[PDB]
Structures are given as structure tokens and as C-alpha cells.
Amino acid sequence: MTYKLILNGKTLKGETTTEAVDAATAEKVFKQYANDNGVDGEWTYDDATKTFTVTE
């Protein structure tokens, strides 16, 4: 299943997607990706659109 991430950091902004079997797996890879790119914010997840968001 395709999941999306909306990045609204101070420095990195945009959207990316990933394929994952479920939501906890997609949250795992999105968190590592955010952390590798120095983004550190509040997170939300909406299962009706399969979209994560991180805001700094």
C-alpha cells in the first residue's frame, strides 16, 4: 500500500511516498528519513488518506 509524507520543516518542505505492508512500517521508514534529513517535529497520521505529516 502507498503511504505519503508531507514535510513541513524549517528547511525541508514537500511530499514523498513509500510502499509498505502497513502503517507502522511506513511510519518507521518515514521517521528514519526525517531524522536523516534533520527534521524534528510533531507528527500526525490520517488513515483515511494514508498520509503522515511532520511539522517543525
54/42 Cα distance (integer angstroms): 6
37/31 Cα distance (integer angstroms): 10
Domain encompassing residue 41: 1-56
Residue with cell 518542505: 13
Total number of domains in the chain:
1
54/45 Cα distance (integer angstroms): 9
Residues 6+ away with beta carbon under 8 Å from 24: none
What CATH number did the domain enclosing 13 receive? 3.10.20.10
